[PDB]
């Protein structure tokens, strides 16, 4: 008696070579055990032929027939070993055993057998907490986790599947130059930081504490996502941009083939209209590269044309309105920093002995609050702020010592008008002062103006605010809070939860591509002299600023309701559907976010009880306890002393932790990521850097504000060359790959055999579709036009769950995937 099987696999890039003695599988019993309690193993069984009968295959997949000698006396197969005797690795999709069908979802690269210390093992798609593991599989389950953890030593190789932690000691390049040395981020009280995936390349020659450079920054093999279409390999684009395209742009500027600076706002608009003319060999260098070639239209000879950013598709001037500047604090790229202001003037916690008197210079009587007194505005909860004063002030002196960087620590006061829109009413541009200061520049307050030199000064004040906001968005809202904060949970999950584990199945879709993009980011984006440092204001101080901010990162404050309450933009109200009442009722990010949050909460609350009947079932789950202990004490270990970490001894705590992880990875990351080119593709709307402070009266620079305000603005913000690079990187990051897996989707319909879990997941997907219809109605509601569309007429679609491929300004992926 033989069991009929079907193996589906994808060749690395003909089929008969998989036959003969190329690939053997051995079934492993879940129910019948050897003398040591381990499931019995069948004979080596080779692929016998190509199956061309199976109608649904697609995706460059091939199917192979196989028949296993297996008596009922051997029990029910629950796992299998596979050995690849071919030289080249293949991608194993699945095994299916017929006549209830048994399904194995594998989705794993299988390298040549000689490269593996122990044989590759795959489990059938049943789901078990550890106390429910069929005994003959208990040791196999634990051994496979031991294999995944490795031993904390060694240089990781491409085919390794070893998950472990290290500090961010791989960003500096001190062996190339002392100027490229960077502080180790993580593992000290000076610089706390999330851990990242261990690579083990070993030390630089000049510094035992910094990891040597490498051509490839390892990730565990199945974290390195293949793509059927090379245009979908968006993560490789930053590498190409830093390594190939950036030097090509630089040469064009070095040879004076294009003007060095923008001279008018039209020179910026030209980038997406007629394009920019570049040297032939510069176009030729750029035009044939995968991913990069999708970023620009070209004549193939001299022109690159960027796509028209969403923010200018209806009005190219509306970004400069005060209405849009404020609206983007609730519905823009970075909609999560604004806070309620409940006293006046705003206060600082910084030491005046270091920075000088920190009293705000904004006077209440100077403000136009539409007829409200300050006491009325405070009491009616109509006063808000965008407060970068205490965040930036500690870094202003060192940033301003750089050539071509000058910033202020900014604070913007906002008033919620009776019509429900925000209006900006003052900007404070603060500088530190200490006795021995060389600079005579002073802090100042700038108020709104529509005419004259005062309008130029106000427009520049908004630019200094948005340089602070862009830096905070890129480093903190985006990099720290999503990419970096998530990676420790990815590592802990593979180290401690078996593929069989229900919480592994719940969480892992929300990790797709995260370790991969992070490793590529450590190599080319956040490295010394990398893309971020060379395009953003803080230069070599950028990543360490994120460490300072991480000192105040609180896991439980990443929950959306807790975030809203903490920032004073909502109050707890148990008479409301979400348990919070928004203080800005039409706050598009928050109002749409609450819907997505509630949908995820329902899903987690339905899934958890399928596997855990009482609080103890959580207390007695050994993998779960080890997982969470390690995630906290190792992964986020610099904050292990903090009192706010959930303990994980109850059903409530398990739901909370899973809910927060899924929210960060899916909707939070989407809302801060997919608006980058749509809003920031016009550099004047989202400047990444500022290069000079406000000019003094009686100077040429002051006269230029009067006579050529667009040039004054362009000389203040990001220069043309870093603009071309920053626009290219945010274009890649704002694109959805065509093989994305969105919230409410999974990569395989058979991820579990548990029908109740599958039903709950279908309900979750239906609810997300229901939510999308509701968000469409919100965008179509003329009463919500001021905040959901603004004068840019850009419907807020960033939290629509679904999307087609491309630069769509919508769609919530499961994971931090770009
Ligand atoms: Fe991202």
In DSSP notation, 635-661 reads: ITGGGTT-TTS----SHHHHHHHHHHH
CA of 318 to the centre of ligand 1 (A): 27
Give the H or E element holding residue 597.
helix 588-607
Strand partners, 277: 303
Among all chains, which residue has been given the structure tokens 């849009």?
324
Among all chains, which residue has been given the structure tokens 């274009």?
731
CA of 737 to the centre of ligand 1 (A): 13
Judge whether 709 is annotated as a binding position: no
DSSP state, residue 178: G
Exposed/middle/buried for residue 52 (C-beta within 10 Å: 0-12, 13-18, 19+): exposed
CB 545 within 8 A of CB 399: no
- Which has the closest alpha carbon to 330: 604, 564, 92? 564
Bridge-based pairing state of the strands 276-277 and 120-123: unpaired
CA 341 to chain centre: 29
Which residues neighbour 436 within 8 Å (Cβ) at sequence distance 6 or greater? none
Q: 470-816 adopts what CATH topology?
A: Lipoxygenase-1; domain 5 (1.20.245)
CA of 733 to the centre of ligand 1 (A): 6
CA of 517 to the centre of ligand 1 (A): 8
CA of 730 to the centre of ligand 1 (A): 10
CB 568 within 8 A of CB 339: yes
d(CA 708, CA 527): 37
Judge whether 673 is annotated as a binding position: yes
Neighbouring CB atoms inside 10 A of 732's CB total: 22
Judge whether 818 is annotated as a binding position: yes
CA of 695 to the centre of ligand 1 (A): 36
Among all chains, which residue has been given the structure tokens 């990543």?
543
Bridge-based pairing state of the strands 409-416 and 383-387: antiparallel
CATH of range 4-146; options 3.50.50.60, 2.60.60.20, 3.40.50.720, 3.40.50.300:
2.60.60.20
Exposed/middle/buried for residue 215 (C-beta within 10 Å: 0-12, 13-18, 19+): exposed
Judge whether 494 is annotated as a binding position: no
CA of 734 to the centre of ligand 1 (A): 8
Crossing angle (nearest 10°) for helices 485-496 and 622-630? 150
Residues in the chain, overall count? 818
Neighbouring CB atoms inside 10 A of 626's CB total: 15
CA 316 to chain centre: 29
Token pair in block for residue 31:
């129910």
Which residues neighbour 82 within 8 Å (Cβ) at sequence distance 6 or greater? 23, 24, 25, 26, 92, 110, 119, 120, 122
CA of 377 to the centre of ligand 1 (A): 37
CA of 531 to the centre of ligand 1 (A): 14
Judge whether 310 is annotated as a binding position: no
CB 569 within 8 A of CB 584: yes
**Terminal Cα distance for the chain, rounded:** 49
Strand partners, 166: 196
Using CA atoms of 677, 682, 684, 687 in order, give the dihedral in degrees to the nearest 10: 30
Exposed/middle/buried for residue 311 (C-beta within 10 Å: 0-12, 13-18, 19+): buried
Strand partners, 581: 571
d(CA 720, CA 709): 17
Token pair in block for residue 637:
């270990």
CB 707 within 8 A of CB 553: no
Active site residues: 478, 483, 669, 673, 818
d(CA 269, CA 279): 20
In degrees and rounded to multiples of 5, residue 203 shows phi and psi of -85, 155
3-state SS of the chain: helix, strand, coil percent to 5? 40, 15, 45
Q: CATH top-level class for 147-246?
A: few secondary structures
Q: Solving technique for this entry?
A: X-ray
CA of 514 to the centre of ligand 1 (A): 9
Q: Where are the CATH 3.10.450.60 domain residues in the chain?
A: 336-469
CB 474 within 8 A of CB 711: no
In degrees and rounded to multiples of 5, residue 628 shows phi and psi of -75, -40
Q: Where are the alpha helices (DSSP H) in 101-195?
A: 135-149
User: Cα separations (Å) of 627 from 394, 400, 632, 804?
Assistant: 37, 44, 9, 35
Task: Count Cα neighbours of 657 within 13 Å in the Cβ-side half-sphere.
Answer: 25
- Which has the closest alpha carbon to 690: 536, 473, 529? 536
Instruction: Give the resolution in Å.
Output: 1.5
- Which has the closest alpha carbon to 714: 453, 461, 463, 411? 463
Using CA atoms of 253, 255, 258, 263 in order, give the dihedral in degrees to the nearest 10: 60
CA of 537 to the centre of ligand 1 (A): 19
Token pair in block for residue 676:
């980058």
Give the H or E element holding residue 485.
helix 485-496
Q: Provide the sign of the torsion angle of the four alpha carbons 665, 669, 673, 675, taken in this order.
A: positive
CB 734 within 8 A of CB 675: yes
Token pair in block for residue 697:
């009266």
Q: Provide the sign of the torsion angle of the four alpha carbons 306, 308, 311, 317, taken in this order.
A: positive
Q: Where are the CATH 4.10.372.10 domain residues in the chain?
A: 247-335
CATH of range 336-469; options 3.60.21.10, 3.40.50.300, 3.40.50.720, 3.10.450.60:
3.10.450.60
CA of 586 to the centre of ligand 1 (A): 26
Token pair in block for residue 757:
């879990």
Exposed/middle/buried for residue 763 (C-beta within 10 Å: 0-12, 13-18, 19+): middle
CATH superfamily membership of 247-335: Lipoxygenase-1; Domain 3 (4.10.372.10)
For the chain, how long is the longest CA-to-CA vector?
97
CB 171 within 8 A of CB 177: no
d(CA 330, CA 416): 12
Number of DSSP helices (H) and strands (E) in the chain, helices first: 27, 22
Long-range contacts of 100-105 (CB under 8 A, 24+ apart): 100/753, 102/76, 102/77, 103/750, 103/753, 104/79, 104/80, 105/748, 105/750, 105/751
Neighbouring CB atoms inside 10 A of 410's CB total: 25
Q: Where are the CATH 4.10.375.10 domain residues in the chain?
A: 147-246
């Amino acid at each position: 008696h033989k069991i009929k099987g079907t193996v589906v696999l994808m060749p690395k890039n003909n089929l008969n070579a998989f036959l003969g003695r190329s690939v053997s599988l051995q079934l492993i019993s879940a129910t019948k055990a050897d003398a040591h309690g381990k499931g019995k193993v069948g004979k080596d069984t080779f692929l016998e032929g190509i199956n061309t009968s199976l109608p649904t295959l697609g995706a460059g997949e091939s199917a192979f027939n196989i028949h296993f000698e297996w008596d009922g006396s051997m029990g029910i197969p629950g796992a299998f070993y596979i050995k690849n005797y071919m030289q080249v690795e293949f991608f194993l999709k699945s095994l299916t055993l017929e006549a209830g069908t048994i399904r194995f979802v594998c989705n794993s690269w299988v390298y040549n057998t000689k490269l593996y210390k122990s044989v590759r093992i795959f489990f059938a798609n049943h789901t078990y907490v550890p106390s429910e593991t069929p005994a003959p599989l208990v040791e196999y389950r634990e051994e496979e986790l031991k294999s995944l953890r490795g031993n904390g030593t060694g240089e990781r190789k491409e085919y390794d599947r070893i998950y472990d932690y290290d500090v961010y000691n791989d960003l500096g390049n001190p062996d190339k130059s002392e100027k490229l040395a960077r502080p180790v981020l993580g593992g000290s009280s000076t610089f706390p930081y999330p851990r990242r995936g261990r690579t083990g390349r070993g030390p630089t020659v000049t510094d035992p504490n910094t990891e040597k450079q490498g051509e490839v920054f390892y990730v565990p093999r199945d974290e390195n996502l293949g793509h059927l279409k090379s245009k979908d390999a968006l993560e490789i684009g930053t590498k190409s941009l830093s390594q190939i395209v950036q030097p090509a742009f630089e040469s064009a500027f070095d040879l004076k083939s294009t003007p060095i600076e923008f001279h008018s706002f039209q020179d910026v608009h030209d980038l997406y209209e007629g394009g920019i003319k570049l040297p032939r060999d510069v176009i030729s260098t750029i035009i044939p590269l995968p991913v990069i070639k999708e970023l620009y239209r070209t004549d193939g000879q001299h022109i690159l044309k960027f796509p028209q950013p969403h923010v200018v598709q209806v009005s190219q001037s509306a970004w400069m309105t005060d209405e849009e500047f404020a609206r983007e604090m609730i519905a823009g790229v970075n909609p999560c920093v604004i806070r309620g202001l409940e006293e006046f003037p705003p206060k600082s916690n910084l030491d005046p002995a270091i920075y000088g008197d920190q009293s705000s210079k904004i006077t209440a009587d100077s403000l136009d609050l539409d007829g409200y007194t300050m006491d009325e505005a405070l009491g009616s909860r109509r006063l808000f702020m965008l407060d970068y004063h205490d965040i930036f002030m500690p870094y202003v002196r060192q940033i301003n010592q750089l050539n071509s960087a000058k910033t202020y620590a900014t604070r913007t006061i906002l008033f919620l008008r009776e019509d429900g829109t925000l209006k900006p009413v003052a900007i404070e541009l603060s500088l530190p002062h200490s006795a021995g200061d060389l600079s005579a520049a002073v802090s100042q307050v700038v108020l709104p103006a529509k005419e004259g030199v005062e309008s130029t000064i106000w427009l520049l004040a908004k630019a200094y605010v948005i340089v602070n906001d862009s830096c905070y968005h890129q480093l903190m809202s985006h990099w720290l809070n999503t990419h970096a904060a998530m990676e420790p949970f990815v590592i802990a999950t593979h180290r401690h939860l078996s593929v069989l584990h229900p919480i592994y199945k719940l969480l892992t879709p929300h990790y797709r591509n995260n370790m991969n993009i992070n490793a590529l980011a450590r190599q080319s984006l956040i490295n010394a002299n990398g893309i971020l440092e060379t395009t953003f204001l803080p230069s070599k101080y950028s990543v360490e600023m994120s460490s300072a901010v991480y000192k105040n990162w609180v896991f439980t404050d990443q929950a959306l309701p807790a975030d809203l309450i903490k920032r004073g933009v909502a109050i707890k109200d148990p008479s409301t559907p979400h348990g919070v009442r928004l203080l800005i009722e039409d706050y598009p990010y928050a109002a749409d976010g609450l819907e997505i949050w509630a949908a995820i909460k329902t899903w987690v609350q339905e899934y958890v009880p399928l596997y855990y009947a009482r609080d103890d079932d959580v207390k007695n789950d050994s993998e779960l306890q080890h997982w969470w202990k390690e995630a906290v004490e190792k992964g986020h270990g610099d904050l292990k002393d903090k009192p706010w970490w959930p303990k994980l001894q109850t059903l409530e705590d398990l739901v909370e932790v899973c809910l927060i992880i899924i929210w960060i990875a899916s909707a939070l990351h989407a809302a801060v990521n997919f608006g980058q080119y749509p809003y920031g593709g016009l550099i004047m709307n989202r400047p990444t850097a500022s290069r000079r402070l406000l000019p003094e009266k009686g100077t040429p620079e002051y006269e230029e504000m009067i006579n050529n305000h667009e040039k004054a603005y362009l000389r203040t913000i990001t220069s043309k060359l870093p603009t071309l690079i920053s626009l290219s990187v945010i274009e890649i990051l704002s694109t959805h790959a065509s093989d994305e897996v969105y919230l409410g989707q999974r990569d395989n319909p058979h991820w579990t055999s548990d029908s109740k879990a599958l039903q709950a997941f279908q309900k979750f997907g239906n609810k997300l579709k229901e939510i999308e219809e509701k968000l469409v109605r919100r965008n179509n509601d003329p009463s919500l036009q001021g905040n959901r569309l603004g004068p840019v007429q850009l419907p807020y679609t960033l939290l629509y769950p679904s999307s087609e491929e491309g630069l769509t300004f919508r769609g919530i992926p499961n994971s931090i995937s770009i």
